[PDB]
Amino acid sequence: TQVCTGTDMKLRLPASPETHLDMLRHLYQGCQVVQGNLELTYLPTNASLSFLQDIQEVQGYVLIAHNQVRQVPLQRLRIVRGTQLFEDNYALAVLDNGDPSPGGLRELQLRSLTEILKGGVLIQRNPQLCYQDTILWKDIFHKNNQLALTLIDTNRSRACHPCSPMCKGSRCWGESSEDCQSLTRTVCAGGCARCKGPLPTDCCHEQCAAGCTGPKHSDCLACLHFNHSGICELHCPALVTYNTDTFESMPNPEGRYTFGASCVTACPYNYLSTDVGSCTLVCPLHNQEVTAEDGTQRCEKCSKPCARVCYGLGMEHLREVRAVTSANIQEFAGCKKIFGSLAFLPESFDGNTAPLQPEQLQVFETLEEITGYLYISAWPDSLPDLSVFQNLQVIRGRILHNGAYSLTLQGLGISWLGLRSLRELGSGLALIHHNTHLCFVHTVPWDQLFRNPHQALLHTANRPEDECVGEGLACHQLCARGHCWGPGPTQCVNCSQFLRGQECVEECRVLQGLPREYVNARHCLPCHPECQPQNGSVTCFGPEADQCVACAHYKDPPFCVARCPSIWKFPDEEGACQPCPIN
Amino acid sequence: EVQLVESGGGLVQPGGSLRLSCAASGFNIKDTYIHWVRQAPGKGLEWVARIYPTNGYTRYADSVKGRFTISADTSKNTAYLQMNSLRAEDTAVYYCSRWGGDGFYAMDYWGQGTLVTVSSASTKGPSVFPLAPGTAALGCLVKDYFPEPVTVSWNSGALTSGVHTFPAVLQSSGLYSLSSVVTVPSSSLGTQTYICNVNHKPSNTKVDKKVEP
Amino acid sequence: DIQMTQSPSSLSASVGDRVTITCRASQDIPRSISGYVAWYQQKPGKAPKLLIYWGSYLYSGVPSRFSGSGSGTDFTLTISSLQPEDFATYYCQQHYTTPPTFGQGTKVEIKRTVAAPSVFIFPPSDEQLKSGTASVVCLLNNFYPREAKVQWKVDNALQSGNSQESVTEQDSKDSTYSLSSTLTLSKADYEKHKVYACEVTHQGLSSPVTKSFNRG
Ligand SMILES: *[C@@H]1O[C@H](CO)[C@@H](O)[C@H](O)[C@H]1NC(C)=O
Ligand SMILES: *[C@@H]1O[C@H](CO)[C@@H](O)[C@H](O)[C@H]1NC(C)=O
């Protein structure tokens, strides 16, 4: 699907090399527009990167570092926007790509790269790279970005074949004839921002951003601001228009929300609509999230000083805080929804700052939604599961660990997960690895929880499956479909038969049983104490003391009662609470 | 003292939804059960729902089952009745009543009732006409309105003797029409003053027309 | 479940006389409901008042002339000295089972000295005519018994089906009725004629009497 999210890992070492590349493949296969940063790092010689073929635009910056691979096929990339920048300076950073026959990047091959709207270029310590010293970078930088830094190292360990003789000014991205830099700014007639040629009638419209196949606002190679169904525009159409006489708001039916550099009739799945017409991943100040009956969340206005919210890591007062710890565990007391993330790390426990004791973890027993991510790299040996989050229902992943993962469990050796209420990972990837004693992984129906095709479970080095089956560690037979989060009848995704509390069971106690029960939506629920259990029949029709087939003791119609109330009554012949004759 | 007050009821389209609210007062409803009984126009009392607020347990007449939910917010000392999927047969006046103490299950206290009409028709506030007067009898003629009722009242609370406010009737057009009259001696006519204060809450409208020789 | 079945469904008695409404439970969970039935009084439009609970116990504020007895599944509300205030529908209820069910209701009505009406006839004023349509209304005030006919005569033409019938609930003090017959006609066949009539037949009349207005 055309728009993917990016990552945010900078130069940090991926913790699971064995799955690192499937994460990139999953993010990027089919993606044309990276809503974030494109970071390609720690890739070995034999890494196939064909899934990058379709990328045209990168909203953030592009980072290519510590790779032994020889080619990154980014030939379709037209435009880097530089919304964020590597080291707050660079839109493109190519660093340390080469061995510490042979390996390392040989040619950038960015032949469609015509526009860098903000930021500059850093290229350092690439032993086998050629042609980079050839490029007229000032042509690629936007008019308002001419003073972008360019810090470029040309130290190589080999000789370069010249640019193909096809190349105009001997400026190229590679030795091939399709690798000549095409210039779109410095070679233009008049004051033209971008042209497709030397004439003044080649010249692109003022709303295009990288070039054009013509003079119109529908002929742009990229939009400088917004794409409105094929037309590049300065802004989208407002959701509201004003009555020419009275100025009452009128819903504009050509109305659109802003999403990245697009106009859209509805924000996409995990995003929030604002009254301002944006699609955001977080309400801007003094707003509250409001959830329609569609499950479709809006950022509406605060009608007063807004209620209190539980922020998690990376929000408000917890913005700069690394881990959940003893110092801040009470911050979560009584929270049902956390705006932000929760990260548990070795320092959470092995502390000045104390050790977070396992029982304090119960604060999260009331937790149903996390809007950021959940990351666990440490967890007390004495707890076999993640049941303190039994009631967690959804992780949105509007913020993801390393830009990538919405759920992450590693180095724990818990024994099962037990996140039994977890029904949705709204976005982001699930990385579960290096949990020696962890079974019940493939017992979870992962893709019932995922919401878009760029999501998957990456898992390696947990307890091996044959070792789980060889100890009878499998879903209890009452769980439907063979899907569960741990051992026993409480851990099922759905009971085949009935539910008593959290326990799946074969039969409620309608006919045989110590405390007799009725049924309600495949639940076993108690008959009132004052119902006499009936041999060979149903004992009760519901919870209330007046839904017995017959009374255990006395009756004060309509209710079976333990004793007649002292407004003075007494038991008569047939057990009925008659009133005393004198008060 | 002790009372209940029904509210939030009036006019709805077929297949619509409305929320009746029953404001308890003078006792706490945790101590007893709260009932909704309804009455169609010129028909008997039909028990509709019960709730025991303490634990929220509810029971429903088969007719309303899975359409009206009844709930009770203990903090407010109030009980609600969320009607959904309103049929035409649900057109009636709705009283909320309580049961008494612990072992006393008669409906001892009742509210005043709110009318609920299920029909697609808008609210036209009527036009109020006069009529022409030893017996001096006169009248007002409030015509073409929907839906009921009408609070006629001659002066503040001055005239309540020989005062007859009639019931309404469905015209073939689909608009109601009543007549409100009053009698007094012929030695008065044009001396003091006589204004019938009519009211129609459904359309916020109000007229205070008069009668004269 | 249980069905309560009252009888009679309606009755008419005179002031001071003894009235007896019965109510009959219907089920195949019989036992003896006697002591677990209640009675309520309701007046037109107003909300029900509790009269009797646990079969025979008189609720506070209720006159003693109201009494209730019962045994088995058959119960009886007597009113030992009927008063004009007592005009109403009376309901029994059982709460021996859930849901608690009401009887169909017994309409009481006070049999009173026959009384002829004080007829009036009212025109559509200059306010009412400046509109699009009009309406002349014919009143029968403070009369008893209930039944009465009101024929319209535009000059001499006998009307078939262009009028409407409205009647008051029996008065709580004198227990008389009151009726309004109105003839639905616009300004179409209004400006035509000049002498509108209204004739009213009633048991308390020797012979139909009529009233009208003069246009000036
Ligand atoms: C504009 O978006 C449309 C899809 O609505 C697409 O066909 C076209 O390529 C886009 N144009 C630009 C310049 O991105
Ligand atoms: C069980 O799963 C079903 C989907 O089959 C879901 O609708 C339901 O809410 C779940 N029931 C529980 C565990 O309450």
Side-chain angles (χ1 to χ4, degrees), chain A, chain B, chain C residues 1-30 32-216:
Chain A
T1 67
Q2 63 180 156
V3 169
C4 58
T5 206
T7 69
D8 182 357
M9 68 179 77
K10 309 224 140 212
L11 305 172
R12 281 173 291 118
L13 202 85
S16 181
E18 301 75 11
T19 56
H20 185 52
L21 188 55
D22 321 27
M23 177 272 290
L24 300 169
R25 178 157 36 72
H26 276 284
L27 292 193
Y28 296 126
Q29 214 148 218
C31 182
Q32 326 211 242
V33 186
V34 164
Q35 288 284 5
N37 311 320
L38 176 72
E39 303 169 298
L40 303 161
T41 54
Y42 304 100
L43 300 165
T45 293
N46 68 326
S48 75
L49 311 182
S50 77
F51 53 75
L52 310 181
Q53 276 164 194
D54 303 323
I55 302 178
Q56 309 188 191
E57 313 185 0
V58 168
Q59 188 145 115
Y61 62 85
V62 178
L63 176 74
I64 294 178
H66 295 271
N67 297 297
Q68 286 111 286
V69 70
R70 301 204 183 80
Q71 301 199 137
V72 299
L74 289 174
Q75 287 94 14
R76 283 193 174 92
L77 184 53
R78 281 144 175 203
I79 182 170
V80 171
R81 285 179 199 286
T83 283
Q84 315 166 52
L85 304 175
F86 188 77
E87 288 172 15
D88 309 313
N89 278 286
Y90 310 104
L92 192 41
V94 179
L95 300 167
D96 299 312
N97 299 290
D99 303 337
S101 274
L105 189 67
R106 318 190 81 212
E107 317 188 336
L108 280 171
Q109 292 195 302
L110 299 167
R111 62 230 210 179
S112 298
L113 182 41
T114 270
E115 187 74 48
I116 295 174
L117 283 180
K118 253 186 290 189
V121 181
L122 179 79
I123 310 192
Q124 304 289 296
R125 292 176 308 290
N126 300 315
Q128 309 280 117
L129 197 76
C130 284
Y131 309 109
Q132 75 267 13
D133 54 355
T134 311
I135 287 291
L136 189 62
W137 292 104
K138 284 180 171 159
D139 187 275
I140 308 179
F141 297 158
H142 190 266
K143 188 179 177 182
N144 307 329
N145 197 17
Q146 290 300 304
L147 298 191
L149 291 95
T150 73
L151 187 31
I152 303 181
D153 160 27
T154 37
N155 293 321
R156 338 182 139 75
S157 309
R158 53 142 197 156
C160 314
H161 300 145
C163 292
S164 143
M166 178 148 180
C167 293
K168 170 173 174 152
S170 26
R171 300 188 166 287
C172 75
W173 297 104
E175 85 183 323
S176 177
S177 78
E178 301 183 82
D179 277 321
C180 306
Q181 185 172 10
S182 70
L183 304 185
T184 45
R185 209 181 67 80
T186 53
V187 79
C188 298
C192 253
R194 293 292 169 189
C195 59
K196 73 183 200 216
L199 268 90
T201 58
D202 284 314
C203 272
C204 315
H205 197 282
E206 111 273 339
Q207 298 281 80
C208 304
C212 54
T213 59
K216 301 184 184 166
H217 61 200
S218 62
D219 301 329
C220 306
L221 291 189
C223 295
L224 178 72
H225 292 109
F226 300 88
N227 189 333
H228 180 201
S229 302
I231 286 78
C232 303
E233 293 188 328
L234 181 56
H235 58 80
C236 294
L239 294 175
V240 177
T241 45
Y242 299 97
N243 182 258
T244 270
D245 286 84
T246 56
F247 282 85
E248 318 282 2
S249 273
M250 296 154 151
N252 171 338
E254 293 304 301
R256 302 280 183 265
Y257 294 85
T258 53
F259 178 44
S262 298
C263 305
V264 156
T265 83
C267 300
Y269 183 74
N270 202 38
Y271 283 77
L272 306 139
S273 296
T274 83
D275 264 43
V276 157
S278 40
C279 301
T280 47
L281 277 164
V282 42
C283 289
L285 199 62
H286 32 279
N287 285 301
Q288 75 207 333
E289 298 183 11
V290 184
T291 300
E293 291 170 40
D294 315 4
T296 297
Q297 303 182 63
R298 315 278 323 257
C299 286
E300 281 171 24
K301 193 210 306 308
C302 284
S303 42
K304 51 150 194 163
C306 259
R308 177 180 150 73
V309 274
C310 305
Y311 292 110
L313 306 186
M315 287 297 268
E316 296 304 336
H317 54 278
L318 296 174
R319 200 177 30 250
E320 322 287 325
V321 166
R322 295 165 53 71
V324 166
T325 73
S326 77
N328 68 40
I329 190 61
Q330 293 298 315
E331 218 75 45
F332 311 111
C335 297
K336 172 156 152 145
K337 185 208 189 86
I338 295 169
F339 295 82
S341 298
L342 291 172
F344 301 97
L345 276 53
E347 59 186 279
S348 296
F349 312 98
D350 22 313
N352 165 224
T353 310
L356 184 49
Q357 298 300 324
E359 50 272 8
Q360 306 188 253
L361 292 179
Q362 286 149 59
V363 287
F364 307 113
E365 66 189 331
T366 46
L367 191 56
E368 296 167 22
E369 158 165 10
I370 297 169
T371 73
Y373 66 83
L374 173 56
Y375 172 105
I376 308 178
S377 71
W379 195 256
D381 281 318
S382 72
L383 301 167
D385 69 0
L386 303 183
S387 66
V388 308
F389 304 110
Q390 272 172 331
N391 299 323
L392 183 42
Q393 282 184 56
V394 30
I395 307 176
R396 301 290 182 194
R398 313 223 184 93
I399 311 149
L400 311 160
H401 184 90
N402 275 336
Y405 311 98
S406 55
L407 182 59
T408 320
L409 305 172
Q410 63 181 46
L412 305 182
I414 40 158
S415 311
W416 60 91
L417 291 185
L419 295 181
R420 69 181 169 195
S421 301
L422 190 58
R423 61 165 178 81
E424 156 170 358
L425 288 171
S427 76
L429 263 137
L431 167 65
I432 299 165
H433 76 97
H434 281 107
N435 300 308
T436 288
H437 302 100
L438 183 46
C439 291
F440 293 102
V441 166
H442 288 292
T443 191
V444 175
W446 290 102
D447 48 38
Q448 262 165 49
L449 289 48
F450 295 137
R451 255 35 163 192
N452 58 94
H454 301 259
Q455 295 179 281
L457 174 52
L458 311 193
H459 65 283
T460 184
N462 303 310
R463 188 153 189 203
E465 256 288 307
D466 58 44
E467 256 157 75
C468 307
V469 73
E471 307 201 338
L473 295 161
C475 289
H476 192 279
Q477 304 304 338
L478 280 171
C479 312
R481 308 284 87 188
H483 298 317
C484 67
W485 292 91
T490 41
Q491 292 295 332
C492 301
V493 166
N494 292 109
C495 306
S496 47
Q497 303 317 129
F498 303 86
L499 189 73
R500 187 190 289 107
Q502 300 288 252
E503 194 167 53
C504 292
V505 313
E506 211 88 65
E507 250 199 313
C508 307
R509 306 200 205 82
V510 198
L511 308 183
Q512 308 164 154
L514 261 150
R516 285 278 209 279
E517 292 171 311
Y518 71 97
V519 155
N520 187 17
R522 285 149 203 164
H523 279 78
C524 312
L525 297 163
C527 301
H528 200 84
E530 300 298 326
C531 291
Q532 191 70 67
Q534 301 293 286
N535 277 25
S537 165
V538 168
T539 302
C540 78
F541 312 100
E544 295 171 305
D546 66 338
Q547 298 175 289
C548 300
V549 169
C551 298
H553 297 273
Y554 310 99
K555 197 190 268 201
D556 191 357
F559 302 102
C560 301
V561 79
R563 46 197 144 197
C564 317
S566 67
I567 313 188
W568 284 84
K569 272 170 169 164
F570 83 100
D572 78 4
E573 292 274 46
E574 304 215 26
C577 301
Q578 292 303 322
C580 288
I582 287 85
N583 187 35
Chain B
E1 218 200 293
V2 203
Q3 82 193 330
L4 304 77
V5 187
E6 298 87 355
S7 46
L11 177 49
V12 193
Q13 289 189 319
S17 282
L18 200 64
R19 201 218 196 188
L20 295 167
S21 328
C22 162
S25 144
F27 76 104
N28 261 40
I29 75 175
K30 76 197 290 166
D31 294 0
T32 189
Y33 295 76
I34 298 307
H35 291 74
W36 282 107
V37 168
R38 76 182 189 181
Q39 185 172 33
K43 302 290 180 183
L45 301 144
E46 184 188 9
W47 168 88
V48 185
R50 196 181 63 181
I51 186 172
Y52 193 43
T54 284
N55 55 21
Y57 294 151
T58 57
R59 272 178 57 75
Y60 306 88
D62 296 14
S63 64
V64 304
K65 192 67 148 58
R67 297 196 304 100
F68 301 8
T69 297
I70 184 210
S71 57
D73 178 33
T74 193
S75 74
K76 282 196 167 201
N77 210 47
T78 315
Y80 306 106
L81 176 57
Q82 172 58 67
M83 295 154 302
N84 298 318
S85 190
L86 271 150
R87 295 162 176 164
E89 56 247 45
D90 299 324
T91 299
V93 164
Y94 287 63
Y95 308 80
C96 74
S97 71
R98 75 174 223 181
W99 268 345
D102 184 53
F104 181 57
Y105 307 120
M107 290 156 176
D108 62 357
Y109 281 87
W110 289 72
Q112 77 280 331
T114 44
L115 180 54
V116 173
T117 14
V118 179
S119 181
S120 31
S122 72
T123 322
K124 188 75 218 305
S127 55
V128 184
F129 314 122
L131 294 174
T135 309
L138 64 94
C140 307
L141 186 58
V142 184
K143 187 145 190 163
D144 293 323
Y145 63 107
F146 193 101
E148 294 216 74
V150 166
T151 299
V152 180
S153 52
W154 299 74
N155 316 136
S156 295
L159 249 65
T160 69
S161 299
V163 185
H164 284 38
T165 311
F166 278 73
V169 280
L170 183 60
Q171 296 172 132
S172 59
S173 48
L175 292 161
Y176 298 155
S177 191
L178 69 81
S179 308
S180 184
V181 305
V182 59
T183 48
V184 284
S186 292
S187 56
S188 55
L189 272 61
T191 302
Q192 181 172 30
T193 173
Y194 287 113
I195 297 184
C196 70
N197 303 302
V198 177
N199 190 230
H200 200 262
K201 294 180 190 174
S203 76
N204 303 47
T205 57
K206 176 164 188 167
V207 202
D208 300 337
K209 300 302 191 206
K210 62 205 173 183
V211 173
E212 66 202 62
Chain C
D1 259 62
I2 282 180
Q3 289 148 211
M4 304 291 271
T5 303
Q6 288 180 242
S7 98
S9 285
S10 33
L11 75 103
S12 177
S14 299
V15 179
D17 196 27
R18 190 201 275 278
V19 189
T20 301
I21 303 167
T22 65
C23 175
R24 205 178 284 263
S26 92
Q27 74 306 124
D28 269 273
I29 45 279
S32 279
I33 293 178
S34 38
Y36 300 111
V37 162
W39 293 92
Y40 305 82
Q41 179 186 69
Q42 192 188 31
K43 310 215 186 186
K46 273 284 185 272
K49 289 198 179 308
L50 187 52
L51 298 184
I52 303 295
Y53 62 92
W54 301 332
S56 67
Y57 284 72
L58 182 52
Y59 186 67
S60 179
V62 177
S64 58
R65 67 187 189 273
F66 291 100
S67 100
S69 72
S71 53
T73 56
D74 320 282
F75 336 103
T76 288
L77 177 87
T78 63
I79 303 180
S80 55
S81 185
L82 194 68
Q83 298 300 340
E85 313 105 69
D86 301 324
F87 170 83
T89 297
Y90 294 88
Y91 300 94
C92 60
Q93 190 184 38
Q94 67 76 26
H95 62 83
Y96 181 73
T97 203
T98 298
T101 47
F102 286 111
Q104 87 268 9
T106 299
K107 313 192 174 179
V108 165
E109 183 254 21
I110 308 298
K111 187 183 172 181
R112 203 210 92 91
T113 299
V114 286
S118 299
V119 183
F120 273 84
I121 182 161
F122 291 93
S125 76
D126 298 10
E127 189 98 316
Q128 186 168 354
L129 291 168
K130 291 166 190 172
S131 60
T133 55
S135 273
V136 183
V137 201
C138 191
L139 170 58
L140 287 74
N141 201 3
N142 302 339
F143 77 102
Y144 191 86
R146 198 184 181 285
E147 307 289 326
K149 193 189 190 177
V150 180
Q151 270 201 150
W152 282 89
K153 277 168 184 168
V154 179
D155 296 0
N156 282 304
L158 218 79
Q159 308 303 328
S160 182
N162 44 38
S163 68
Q164 289 175 236
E165 302 299 327
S166 191
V167 58
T168 62
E169 299 282 339
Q170 200 172 52
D171 189 86
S172 64
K173 304 193 163 180
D174 67 36
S175 72
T176 61
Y177 287 105
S178 286
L179 194 155
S180 90
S181 193
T182 177
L183 202 67
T184 307
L185 276 175
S186 68
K187 202 183 170 185
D189 199 70
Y190 175 72
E191 299 282 52
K192 187 185 172 189
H193 297 267
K194 304 166 188 174
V195 55
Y196 298 95
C198 187
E199 201 132 49
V200 181
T201 314
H202 185 47
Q203 191 193 140
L205 298 170
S206 296
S207 185
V209 194
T210 180
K211 247 198 165 65
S212 58
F213 61 85
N214 190 55
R215 305 165 91 272

